[PDB]
């Protein structure tokens, strides 16, 4: 009975920021953050996020499986014990198992960072992992935060995560086109048929946060009352 | 889950599939879940429903061969897929076999416990998997077991014991192409792990019930005819203890 909303967008578009803001409007609303802290210290452990950026042809498959697993684990745990003694419970996911596969992993495959065997294994693993464990995780709606790759590049410097500081603009441009093809043009098809009827709210977040944040929060409230 | 689950464990080419495929013929309540070795040497993911009508299921990579050729690069990848494909196969047969059995028994060729505590652990110990890879693998494997709880728990284990030299010869007899370069030293390491887990029972697992699961050790070093009778008898006796 919890409504599951995924918040999607490029790296450093502003998703944790916006969603941590939005959480405070209702006691009924909670967030599942993207487990980037677990990725940076594998458990002090290895930094598999950094391994993937420095040696993507070596570490990409390993990173992607750990990434998707940590996300499902965290999403299932928030569903199972949180809210539910609540009038209208909403859970916001920072991204989903669908961006894991169809944006990020897919882009590593198209870049030759994963070979054909690695990609076939990843998809088999993802198909099976989701058909079992991830049934309770189907999305009721998606919020797309769009910001240009230049904005996202600026916001990477501003935030200052060490593993990310060498990300080139052209890398962010590739991830942007994939989001646009998925969530704006809707030309990117998944092997999950329910996803084609999931409503999408696109929000422009290119501006500084004083500029639009009232309209944005309100649009989210409008959007959620519909579901 | 009135179905009794019995795993068959032992080294490569010990004779596990030969024994159990013959053994299961004694009852209609006995079935076997093979190890998905063919899926590992020919890697394939599911086709789209419209694409498969016009496109053949192509032969994919051989991650079994890749692991044997460069274990340091491919071990983690191989072991993750080795365990996934096994769990998928084991759970499906649990859900759909032996619905009209009186005393149903499902034999598993190996288990998720040997995937981790024998094979993957030996790869880590050989430094074919690094600390980050071993941590990820174990975390994954742990989380998956929690999720089923008692779904795949074993009522018993049958250990088929064969010397490294026997297995090495049997690898040659069988003729599986990717196994032909396996040195005796590798088989001997796997041999010591089974003995610790299954015979001396000193190997510690995160799964507490295993410390007390009934185990039957059978020597399969002899030619097949020479001992099959005594074996089948030990097995039937064992099964009635459970
Ligand atoms: N609208 C905005 N205007 C200026 N900075 C923003 C805005 N939204 C987010 N930021 C900043 O950009 C960085 C990335 O935001 P964050 O929420 O961490 O991105 P994400 O969660 O999408 O990776 C942080 O420094 C954050 O303070
Ligand atoms: N007891 C035995 N005596 C002679 N050959 C055997 C015996 N058990 C198995 N074999 C042969 O040894 C090879 C390996 O057996 P197999 O059951 O495929 O091993 P596993 O399933 O443990 O890898 C096959 O060629 C099989 O015919
Ligand atoms: N499956 C994923 C998910 C996210 N990423 C990148 C890598 O880290 C950032 C965190 O926002 O995003 C990724 O590379 N792969
Ligand atoms: N998890 C596993 C399971 C089995 N093996 C080896 C590799 O494949 C042969 C098949 O018996 O055995 C392995 O290397 N790792």
Curated annotation (Swiss-Prot), chain A:
Name of the protein: Deoxycytidine kinase
Domain of life, per lineage: Eukaryota
InterPro entries documented for this protein: DCK/DGK (IPR002624), Deoxyribonucleoside_kinase (IPR050566), DNK_dom (IPR031314), P-loop_NTPase (IPR027417)
One GO-annotated biological process of the protein: dAMP salvage
EC number(s) per entry: 2.7.1.74, 2.7.1.76, 2.7.1.113
UniProt keyword list: ATP-binding, Kinase, Nucleotide-binding, Nucleus, Phosphoprotein, Transferase
Cellular compartment(s): Nucleus
CDD domains: dNK (cd01673)
One family name in Pfam for this protein: dNK
